[PDB]
Amino acid sequence: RPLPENEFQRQVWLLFEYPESSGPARIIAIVSVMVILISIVSFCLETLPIFRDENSQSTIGYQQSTSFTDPFFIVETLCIIWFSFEFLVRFFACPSKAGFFTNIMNIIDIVAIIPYFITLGTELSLAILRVIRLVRVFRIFKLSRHSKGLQILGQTLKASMRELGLLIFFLFIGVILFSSAVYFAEADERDSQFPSIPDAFWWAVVSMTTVGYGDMVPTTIGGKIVGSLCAIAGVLTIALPVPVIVSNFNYFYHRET
Amino acid sequence: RPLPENEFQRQVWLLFEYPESSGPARIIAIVSVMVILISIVSFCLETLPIFRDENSQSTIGYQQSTSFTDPFFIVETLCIIWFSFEFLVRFFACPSKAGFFTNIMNIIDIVAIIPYFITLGTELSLAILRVIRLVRVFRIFKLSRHSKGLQILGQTLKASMRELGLLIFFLFIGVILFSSAVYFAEADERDSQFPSIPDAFWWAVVSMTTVGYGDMVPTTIGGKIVGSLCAIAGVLTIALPVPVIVSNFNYFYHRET
Amino acid sequence: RPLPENEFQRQVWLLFEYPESSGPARIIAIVSVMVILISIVSFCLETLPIFRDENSQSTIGYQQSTSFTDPFFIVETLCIIWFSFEFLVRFFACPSKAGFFTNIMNIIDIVAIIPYFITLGTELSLAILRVIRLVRVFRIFKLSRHSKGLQILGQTLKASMRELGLLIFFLFIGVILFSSAVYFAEADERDSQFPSIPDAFWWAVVSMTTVGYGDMVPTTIGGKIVGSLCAIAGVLTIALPVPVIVSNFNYFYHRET
Amino acid sequence: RPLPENEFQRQVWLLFEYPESSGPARIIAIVSVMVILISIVSFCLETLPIFRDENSQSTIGYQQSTSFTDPFFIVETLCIIWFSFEFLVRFFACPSKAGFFTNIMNIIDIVAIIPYFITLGTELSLAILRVIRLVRVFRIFKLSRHSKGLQILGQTLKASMRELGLLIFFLFIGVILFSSAVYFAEADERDSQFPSIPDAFWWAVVSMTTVGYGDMVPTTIGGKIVGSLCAIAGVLTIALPVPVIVSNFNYFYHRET
C-alpha cells in the first residue's frame, strides 16, 4: 500500500486526467484531434488516382526512402511521430503500469502499432498483407479517446453483443432461405441473374436490409414473389433487436445525467 | 392415464428431460450443430456453376447412384444418415407416439426426412419434384432445436399471427391500389414499363417496402406522383404492426432472462 | 342507438348487418367477400396484354354486347348485379334518407357503384370521365365492411389527419429545398440528370423516402453532398410523425380487446 | 418587453402578429401565405426549359432591361415588394432597439437580411453570385411564421443539436470506414467502380442510409461482404439518435396543449 514515490508520473497523470481543468491540457487535446483528422484526410487523399500511380516493396503501399519526396509519406511520418510520442507519454506517466492495458483506447493504439513491429521482425499466406493494410485505417477509432459519444457507442455495442448476434443470425438464416428460394424459382431461365445460391446471397442481403441495388433482380413470377417475401421478412427481422440495441444506447446515453 | 409401470421408461424420460445433464450431451449437441452447418454449406456449394454445369437430369438436380462418386452426394448421404440416426434415437423412447408430434421441432425433422421417402416412392404431377428439391433447404430450421433465439422468433411469429396477417392484408390492398393507379397513369404511353396491373405489382411491392430497384419506374408526371404516394403509404403501412410484433418479440425475449 | 321500432326492418337489419348472428348471415357475408375478391381479380386480369387487346373503346372503357362472350364482362356484370342487390337491400332498411350521407362506409359504396350505372345512364366536361375511370378501382375499400383491421386503419387515418398533414408538409418542404439545391449544384453540366427543379422533385422524393431508384442521380461533388443531406433529412422527417400515427393505430387496435 | 407607449405601433403589431385576433388579420395572413406559395411556385417554374430558354438569365437569375415588359418579372418584383412591405411594417413595431441581444427573432432577421444588403451594395467574383442565387431559395422557410408544425420542427432541431451531431459523427465514421474497406477489397480489379476512397464515400452514404442507387456497387466477394456490413451498420447507426430526436419532437408537439 506504499506510495509509488516517483512524484512526476503521478503528477503528470493527475494534470492530464481533467483536460477541462487547465488550458494546456485542452490545447494538447485539440492538437491531438487535429492531428488525427489530418492523418485521416491524408490517408483518404493518398488513394486518389492522381497520386496513387505516382507513388514486398510494391504491395506494401509505401516505399521507404531517406529523402521522402512524397508529401503523403511526410505527413504520414509526422502523424506517426505524434502518435508514438503520445503513446510513450501516456505509457511512462501511467501510475497503474500493470493495469495499463485496461483502457480500450490504449489497446486500439497497441493493435495499430503491432503491425510495424511484426513487419520489422518478419523482414529478416498472402491475405495477411491485405488484411494488415486494411487494418491500417482504424486510427479513426482513436477518436474515441476524446469523443464521449463514440464511447457511448462502444459501450452500447459491448452491452448488446447477444442482440447483435441474434440480428446477424436471423439475417443469415433469412439470406440463405430466400437466396435458395429465388435461385430455384428462376433456375429454368437463361436470362436469370442468379447463377448460384452464393451469388443470390448478395441480392438477399440488399433486399432484406431494404437497400435495393438493381444489379441482380428477379424476372420470374416466382422470383418476384420470393423477392416480395424477402423484403417483408427483412424488415420484420431487422426490426426485432434494433429496439433492444436502441434501449441500450439510450441507457448509456442518459446515464451521465 | 395409467403409468407405463415398466420401471425403466421413467428413467429414460428423466435422462432425456435434461439436455444439459452431462458433457457428452454437450459434445453430441456440438456435433449436431456442426453437421447441420456442414449440410447447409454443402447444399449451397452444390449449386455453383463450377460443379453443377461441369459434372429428369435437370428437373431433379441430383442423380442417385450406388457408386456415389460425387463428393456432394457423399456429404449429403452422411448428413442424412446422421439426421436419421438422431431421429430414430429420439423416437425409440416414446411410448405414446400418437401424441408425440405435438412439438413442431420433430415435424421439422420429419419434413427434412420426407425427401428420402418421396424419392423411394417415386423411384418405383410435376410440382412435386421442384417442391421436394426446395424443401430440401428447410433443414436450416432444425437449428431451432439448438438456438434459443430462433425459438423466441418462432414464439413471436406464433403469437403475432393476427398482426402479421394485417401487415400482409394492408400491403396487398396498397399494392393493388397503387399498381392500378400507376398503370392507368402511364397507360397512354408506348414507352411505359408497366404492361399491366399484375406486372405493376412488382413495382408496388418494391416501392412500398422502400427497397427500390429501378428496373420498373414511372416516367410520366402522374406516374411519379403515384410513386411518391406509393412510397409514403408503404412506410405508413409497414410501420403500423411492426411495433406490435416488436413488443411480442421483446416480451418473449425478456421472459427467458 | 335506439331500435327502429318498425318490428320488421329490424329483422333484415340484424340479418344483413351482423353476420355472426346466424348461419345464413355468415354464408351471405362469405359470398359477398368472395364476390369482391373475384371482382378485384377480374379487374386486375382484364388489363393483361393477353386479354385487353382482344376485348368508343376509350370513352366508355367497356364493350356492351347481348351475347357477352368476354368472360371479364360477364364477371363484371355479375359482380355489379350483386353489389346493386346488396346496396338496395341495405338501403331498404335505412329510415333516415336525409342523414344517409353521414356514414362514410355507405358513401364509399355509392361512389364505387356510381361509375358503371351513371355512365350507362349518360350514354343514353372531360375530366369527369377520367375521374370516373380512376374511381372504378375503389371497390377494394368495400372490403372494409367485412374486415375489422381495415376499419381500424380507417379510424387511425381519420384520427391522425393533422400529423399526416404535417408529414406531407415536411416532405414537401424538404423536397423543394433539396431539389433546388441539387439542381443548382449540377446546373452547369450537360450530362446532368436534373433538367429542372420540378424534374428533381422525383429524385428528392425517392431519396427522402429512402427508396432509391438510380434513374436520376447526382454526378458532381456538390450534388452528392446534397443527396447525402437529402437521405439524412428524409429519415429525420419521416421518423417524426410516424410514431404518433403508430400510437393512434395501437390505441384503436387495442381498444377492441 | 415594455410597450412602446406610442399608442399606434401597438395596433399595427397586434394586427400583423395575431391573425386570430381579428378578421382583417386573418385575411392578411392568408394573403401572405398565398404570396409565399406563389413565389415558391414561380421560382420552381422559372428553371423549366420551356421558360428559361424562352426568356445571362441563369448566372444572375434576372433579365436586366429598361422596359421591364416581362409580366413574370413584374410578378416577382410584386412578391419582393410585398415581402419588403411586411418587413418594414414589422420593423416599425420594435420599441427597444438597444435590446437587440435579447430577441432571437431580430438576430434571425438581421442574419437573413445581411445577404440582401450585400446584394443591394453589389447591384450599384463567381462563387458569390451562385451562392446568392442558391440562398434565394430560403423564402420557403418564411412559411414557418404561419405554420405551427414547422415551428415545432425548428424547436426540435434546436433542442436536438447534440443528438443530430452524434448522428452526423457516427455516419461520418462509418462512411470513411466502409469506403476504405470497399476500396481496398475491390482494389485488385480492372473493372472496379471505386477509383478512390472519396469516390466510395457516395456509395457508403447511399448504402448506410439504406437508400441504394446501383450506380456504383461492389463486384468482388470482399466488396459484397463489406457492402452487407455497410447496410447493417448504417441501420444500426441511424436508428440510435432518431428515437431521441423523436422524443424531442413529441415533447414539443404535445407542449402546445
* CATH number of the domain where residue D229 is located: 1.10.287.70
* Residue D4, in any domain of the structure: no
**Rounded to a whole number, what is the distance in Å from the CA of A130 to chain B's nearest CA?**
26
Please enumerate residues of B whose Cβ is less than 8 A from a Cβ of D: 211-212, 214
How close D71 gets to chain B, by Cα (Å)? Answer: 27
The torsion angles phi and psi of A4, rounded to 5 degrees, stand at -60, -35
- On whether both C121 and C218 belong to a single domain, the answer is no
Task: Using an 8 Å CB-CB cutoff, list residues of chain C that contact chain A.
Answer: 211-212, 214
Number of neighbouring beta carbons within 10 Å of residue B119: 14
- Measured CA to CA, the distance from residue C74 to residue C58 in angstroms comes to 19
C177 within domain boundaries: yes
Mark whether C198 and C221 lie in a shared domain.
Answer: yes
D177 and D108 in a single domain? The answer is no
Dig out the grid coordinates for B212 from the structure: 427500390
In whole angstroms, what is the distance from residue A51 CA to residue D149 CA?
50
CB-CB neighbors (< 8 A) of C40 in chain B: 176
Minimum CA–CA partner of D208 in chain A: A211
Distance from the C215 Cα atom to the nearest Cα atom in chain A, whole angstroms: 11
Which residues does C232 contact at the CB level (< 8 Å), separation at least 6? D167, D168, D171, D209
Which residue in chain A has the smallest CA separation from C210? A211
| Residue ranges of chain D whose CB lies within 8 Å of a chain B CB | 211-212, 214
- Count CA atoms within 13 Å of residue C78 on its CB side: 18
C43 within some domain: yes
Residue D255 CB partners (closer than 8 Å, separation 6+)? none
Instruction: Give the gap in angstroms from C-alpha C29 to the nearest C-alpha of chain A.
Output: 30
CA-closest candidate to residue D141, choices D93, D109, D107, D104:
D109
Decide if B255 is inside a domain. no
Domain count, chain A: 2
Task: Give B147's contacts in chain A (Cβ within 8 Å).
Answer: 169
Residue C154 to residue C190: CA distance in whole angstroms: 47
User: Are B227 and C246 an interchain contact pair (Cβ–Cβ within 8 Å)?
Assistant: no
Residue pair B244/B173 in contact by the 8 Å Cβ criterion = no
Q: Which residues of C165-202 are buried (b: 16+ CB within 10 A; e: fewer)?
A: ebbebbbbbbbbbbbbbbbbbbbeeeebbbebbbbbbb
Residue A167 CB burial class (10 angstroms; 0-12, 13-18, ≥19): buried
- Of D92, D115, D146, which one is at a domain's C-terminal end? D146
Residues D26 and D73 occupy one common structural domain:
yes
Do D42 and D132 lie in one domain? The reply is yes
Q: Contact at 8 Å (CB) between C34 and C61?
A: no
A133 CB neighbours in chain D (<8 A) are 184
Task: Identify how the structure was determined.
Answer: cryo-EM
Q: How far apart are CA C183 and CA C191, in angstroms?
A: 13
Chain C interface with B: residues with Cβ < 8 Å: 40, 43-45, 47-49, 52, 133-134, 137, 140, 143, 147, 149-150, 153, 156, 164, 167-168, 171, 201-202, 205-206, 209-215, 238, 242, 245-246, 249-250, 253
Q: Do B167 and A212 touch (CB under 8 A)?
A: no
Q: How many CB atoms lie within 10 A of CB B47?
A: 22
Resolution given for this structure, in angstroms:
3.2
Same domain, residue pair C102 and C224:
no
Residue B125 forms part of a structural domain: yes
Rounded CA-CA distance D254/D149 in Å is 11
Looking at the structure, tell me whether residues C183 and C138 fall in a common domain: no
Angstroms from B67 CA to nearest CA on chain D:
35
Residue C66 C-alpha, separation from nearest chain D C-alpha, in angstroms: 50
Using beta carbons and an 8 Å cutoff, which residues of C are at the interface with D? Answer: 166, 169-170, 173, 176-177, 180-181, 183-184, 187, 195-198, 207, 210-214, 217, 224, 227-228, 231-232, 235-236, 239-240, 243-244
CB C160: neighbour CB atoms within 10 A?
Answer: 22
Domain assignment of residue A250, yes or no: no
- Domain annotation covers residue A87: yes
Length of chain D as a residue count: 257
The range of the structural domain enclosing residue B84 comes to 9-146
Q: Does residue B16 share a domain with residue B127?
A: yes
| Closest by Cα among D38, D120, D108, D118 to D79 | D38
Within 8 A by CB and 6+ apart from D192, the residues are: D186, D219, D220
**Pick from A37, A39, A19: nearest CA to A27:** A19
- Say which CATH number the domain at C138 has: 1.20.120.350
- Which of B133, B142, B213, B248 is the best substitution to test chain A (most A C-beta atoms within 10 A)? B213
Q: Per the domain annotation, does D90 fall within a domain? A: yes
User: Phi, psi at residue D216, to the nearest 5°?
Assistant: -125, 120
Residue pair C162/D253 in contact (Cβ under 8 Å)? The answer is no
Q: Are D109 and D234 members of one domain? A: no
Cα distance from N-terminal residue to C-terminal residue, chain B: 35
Of D82, D111, D146, which closes a domain? D146
- The contacts of residue C140 (CB under 8 Å, 6+ apart) are B173, B176, B177, C36, C40
Distance CA B248, CA B159 (A): 7
Q: How far apart, in whole angstroms, are the C-alpha atoms of residue D194 and residue A193?
A: 22
Identify whether residues B73 and B135 lie together within a single domain: yes
State the smallest CA–CA distance between residue C121 and chain D in angstroms.
Answer: 41
Residue C168: closest CA among C134, C203, C208: C208
Closest CA to B242 of C184, C95, D152, A242: A242
CA torsion through residues C145, C147, C148, C154, sign = negative
Q: Do B122 and B215 share a domain, yes or no?
A: no
Contact D227 A206 (CB under 8 A): yes
Instruction: Please tell me whether residues B177 and B106 are part of one structural domain.
Output: no
